[PDB]
Amino acid sequence: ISGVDLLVDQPFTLEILTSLVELTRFETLTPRFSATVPPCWVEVQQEQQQRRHPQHLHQQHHGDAAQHTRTWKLQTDSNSWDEHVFELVLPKACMVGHVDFKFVLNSNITNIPQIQVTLLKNKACPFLEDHKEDILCGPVWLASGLDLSGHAGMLTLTSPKLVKGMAGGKYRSFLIHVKAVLRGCDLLQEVSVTIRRFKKTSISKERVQRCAMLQFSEFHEKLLNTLCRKTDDGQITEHAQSLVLDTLCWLAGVHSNGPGSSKEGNENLLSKTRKFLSDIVRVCFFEAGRSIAHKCARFLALCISNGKCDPCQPAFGPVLLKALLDNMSFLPAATTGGSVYWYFVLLNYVKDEDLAGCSTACASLLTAVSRQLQDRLTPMEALLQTRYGLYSSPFDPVLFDLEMSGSSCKNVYNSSIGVQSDEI
Amino acid sequence: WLGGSEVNPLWTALLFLLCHGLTTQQRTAIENATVAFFLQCISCHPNNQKLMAQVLCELFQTSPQNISGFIRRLFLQLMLEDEKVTMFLQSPCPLYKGRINATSHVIQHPMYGAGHKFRTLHLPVSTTLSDVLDRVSDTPS
Amino acid sequence: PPHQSIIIERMHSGARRFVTLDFGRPILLTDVLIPTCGDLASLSIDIWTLGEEVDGRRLVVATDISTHSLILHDLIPPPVCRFMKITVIGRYGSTNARAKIPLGFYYGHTYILPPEIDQHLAMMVALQEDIQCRYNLACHRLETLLQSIDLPPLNSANNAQYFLRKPDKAVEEDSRVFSAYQDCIQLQLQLNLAHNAVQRLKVALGASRKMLSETSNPEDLIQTSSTEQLRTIIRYLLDTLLSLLHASVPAVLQSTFHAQACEELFKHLCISGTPKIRLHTGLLLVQLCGGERWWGQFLSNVLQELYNSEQLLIFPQDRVFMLLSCIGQRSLSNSGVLESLLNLLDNLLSPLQP
Amino acid sequence: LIPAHSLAAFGLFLRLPGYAEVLLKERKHAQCLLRLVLGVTDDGEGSHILQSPSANVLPTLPFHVLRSLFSTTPLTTDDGVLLRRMALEIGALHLILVCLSALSHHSPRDVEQALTKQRLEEEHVTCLLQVLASYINPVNALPSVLLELLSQSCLIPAMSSYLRNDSVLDMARHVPLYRALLELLRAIASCAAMVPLLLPTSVGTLLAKMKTCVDTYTNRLVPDIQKTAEIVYAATTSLRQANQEK
Amino acid sequence: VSQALDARLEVGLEQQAELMLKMMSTLEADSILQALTNTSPT
In the record, which residues are listed under signal peptide (chain E)? Predict the structure, then answer.
């Protein structure tokens, strides 16, 4: 720590942010790993999951990714197991970022299995009770990672204390323990687990830099200030803004599963987020482009999920609602159609709170806008609409969006493709 | 009178305005109005044709440095197309061709009359009289 | 934008299909859309720039495309690509008739940035200026084309005959108008795409947009925005209003949308707007004020004002009539709808009785 | 400020003084060429130029109108010599020889589509050679640069290569280009200024070779085009022989 | 909705956000179809 200038301390510049994202950059384990399984599972051969996935080895010649898809099929015996133990092996020293825990439900499942994967942090009659002070790292719920289909999903295994490791990014014990709260864990069909880590950086003491990034809250304060304010000296390029959104997205992702002790940093960031939420939305939607709007939508989704995951602290939905409704009147001055699309996507979900205020603002804006629109109709356009049913005005040079089918692609070219038959 | 010495500076000033506090719709409306005004002044007046040719030549000579902008469109749709002239007929026999039973509203100068004994067409000068006859009357066709 | 599908061989659907696509230059691919393919069981995309085995990658695998169409709205971070590989598995049964694979659509930036930027911006500006000039010429042609045509009012038998059987000159002039309008909209879209690209390149220099450095009062914002932006805002806002209503009791909403507000909103939207916003406005009105007492009298007043033989406004009478019929059917439970309509019909036939 | 080279030539040709007036003799194509320039590529009536009723002739207009100008503008008056000069400085004749090199492949020193492109290319080079011939004759006169620029050039290799083809069945179907060749040899032999450019297998010997060969093939052993071809070829060959000796 | 999402396992786990961001829209599109066709004004 001493004698090393932390990346947080220096004033933010484009190259500094580019270095910062390199810390958050994340990769895969190239070295081989191993694991053991309870006897009720049988490891599925690696090419069985290659059934619809024929080009796994071609993209990466090393082939460890083919081994990375370690699959166990569940042999449902008469025992209705309520606990399981999965041992991990980390032969080559590395700093894992998160463990890719993927779960798929059986095709015939109709109920919601209240299966929980709770792993308290490590400090030195279910295992979560006898060894309540000896559990390793988590915790999560299975339903959190449940996907749209409801028959599969993938859980996130990360924590602010995960990156530090046992001591300086070493491995001593990683145990994936599952306990359900026909019935129970027997509904789960098969499990695949992948271990993936951080990319190597050209920055000395990457562990120290990551620790400084995660610990200090003034880093969060400065990041939110940089994102929000755009002053005369703050001629912040949207490249730097995109980097800032990436940094906050990674930070919220790693703070998502932080335990009660780790909630200090989470609340430190969320207090500033609530302080500057109106400016965040205003900038990232009504001033920035579509990509920045998508990044801000992702960050706000992480914040909403974090507020849901922490009932001990006030929820984020109502505050997001006030921010969006306060920024509502700026819609006619918005830049692009994709940003407005993402704004309304976020707004629609948070309608569950204060329906009266949202409806009032919507009606006011509609009444204000509608009168203006009718004044801009011309006899030319009216003739076109009546005689031919052509409603798009051709004499107006400026457009707003091009919604082909469930997408907003006005800010990008249409790619001209020369088709190659090649392999017939 | 629009070719008079008093009005001559207007052409150059207009071109100066349109070849560099105007909104986009204002600029488009001004461009269309200028093109229409020039085309009206040039329609069948050789003197005004010479004056506009002189104005264009001097503007091109004094233009620094590629051709684009309003001047390109003005040159392309003022010249490089057939001239239009209003041609006005009348006869002791009615001219039925070109009329439909729908209640169409056409408003022209009163000197062109009304009814089946009059007809006015805005058609290119390059056309021949046979086109006039078989477009105004059924009998030639 | 180009579009033309290509044929395949050994049409039997049991086996694999292979399609490899190359743009001839690295492309910042950021959007992929492929329509639903019923006779297909799987689909995948593989991406590489230098080589399939050198830097090959994959980004999505689609399985339910038989009854669905995959959409990749925003690929962030944008994968750099020049070569795209398509691998699909048809229906498991290897017996099928002739079918054509829909290629889909792929959107992405052509110029890649982390120098060409300055001269690329200059040439893009020149291209935008040329496209603007061509678009202005197309607009002038369309304007001078429509100026010579007229719509006969539907108030006589002769006009009805004209609408039933269009004369030949009307048909050919309509074809010419449609062609000119299609050219105009093509040039408009090209100009907007070029301007967006130029704006993105200027953003790459850090020159952010003006963004309300003059005023922020809404009464100027609403009256200074573009028409298309207002239409998109109205569409989204009406959509959210419909969602909010379907999710309930918003008593405040019913208070604001009284008789005068409903009159004004109907006349502004359902008469001049695009069909989508017209239908949505009608449905929102019938869902909100359908049970009101003043409703039905609203419909009678609207019909009498719009379809009066003294009406001078030009509007798509048939479409708004269909909208009125649909609204009347939905709001039929209200007792005043037929009472008001029959009272109106009673007054129109009054001159028969001396 | 299809084909691409014709438009560049048209832009270069139009800068020549007096070319605007002669281009406007046939007005509608002249408008089409100018409309084809400036990038709109459309008429005033909404019909694409490339699908215009007379779009086939479009490539020929620049060089053909320049040939008409050359016929109407003799080398006698000051107009001809000034036109020759402002041709030489701006690279008008230089670009003429460059595009000849492009369309003839003589550097300085699919069956249906193949035959169609061969036809269009041979007609284009025919027009180019014939307009160059009209450039040679009126109907410091010889440019100083032309003296150097015909040596290590394309014109002499073009003549050599096109005189390599001595098919006895060629002139039966190849009448237009051989007519242009006859006219250009008439110019090269009758023009006093052009004679020193040629006179220091030789051109005269192999020209006599074709004359004797065709005389043996036809005279010793036809419709209007062929018979006119032989009679004019014999007359022009006699004139060229008379001019060559001095 | 096609429930098809790009292979972002390799990147940090924004995937759960992306699924629910995909789920953000899905609960909207269905309700509107239920708003205008279903739930006839009564």
Answer: none
HSE-up of residue B102 (Cα within 13 Å, Cβ side) = 22
Strand partners, D120: none
Q: Can the peptide bond before residue D3 be classed as cis, meaning omega within 30 degrees of 0?
A: yes
Contact E3 A348 (CB under 8 A): no
Q: Do C134 and D46 touch (CB under 8 A)?
A: no
Cα A274 to Cα D4: distance, rounded to the nearest angstrom: 63
Closest CA to A405 of D209, C68, D122, D187: C68
Q: Which DSSP symbol is given to A26?
A: B
Distance from CA of C39 to the nearest CA of B (A): 50
Technique used to solve these coordinates: cryo-EM
Element (H, E) at C324: helix C317-330
**Cβ–Cβ pairs < 8 A, chains A and B:** 3
Among all chains, which residue has been given the structure tokens 């041609």? B87
Resolution in angstrom units: 3.0
DSSP state of B125: T
> Which residues, in sequence order, are CB contacts of A100 under 8 Å at separation 6+?
A154, A157, A193, A194, A195, A196, E9, E13
**Which of A144, A196, A297 comes nearest E10 by C-beta?**
A196
Euclidean distance between CA atoms A266 and A160, whole angstroms: 10
With a CB cutoff of 8 Å and minimum separation 6, the contacts of A301 are E17, E20, E21, E24
Nearest residue in C to E1, CA atom: C68
Count of residues in chain A: 424
Residue in the block written with tokens 């409703």: C295
Contact partners of C by the rule of 3+ C-beta pairs under 8 A? A, B, D, E
The pair of structure tokens assigned to A411 is 């800010």
Helix axes B24-42, B70-78, angle to 10 degrees: 30
- Is residue A385 classed as helix, strand or coil in its secondary structure? helix
Longest dimension (CA), chain C: 94
Separation CA C335–CA C333 (nearest Å): 6
Contact D58, D33 (CB under 8 A): yes
What residue spans of C257-296 are helical by DSSP H? 259-269, 275-289
Contacts of B27 (CB under 8 A, 6+ apart): B18
Tokens of D128: 């180019």
Cβ distance of B31 and C137 shorter than 8 Å: no
Secondary structure of chain D as H, E, C letters:
CCCHHHHHHHHHHHCCCCHHHHHCCCHHHHHHHHHHCCCCCECCCCCEHHHCCCHHHHHHHHHHHHHHHHHHCCCCCHHHHHHHHHHHHCCHHHHHHHHHHHHHCCCCCCHHHHHHHHHHHHHHHHHHHHHHHHHHCCCCCCCHHHHHHCCCCCHHHHHHHHHHCCCCCHHHHCHHHHHHHHHHHHHHHHCCCCHHHHCCCCHHHHHHHHHHHHHHHHHHCCCHHHHHHHHHHHHHHHHHHHHHCC
Integer distance in angstroms from the first to the last C-alpha of chain A? Answer: 60
Phi, psi (degrees; rounded to nearest 5) at C207: -80, 90
Rg (CA), chain D: 19
Strands A96-105 and A115-117: unpaired
Task: Tell me whether the omega of the peptide bond preceding residue A139 falls within 30 degrees of 0, making it cis.
Answer: yes
Query: Cβ of C233 and A374 within 8 Å?
Result: no
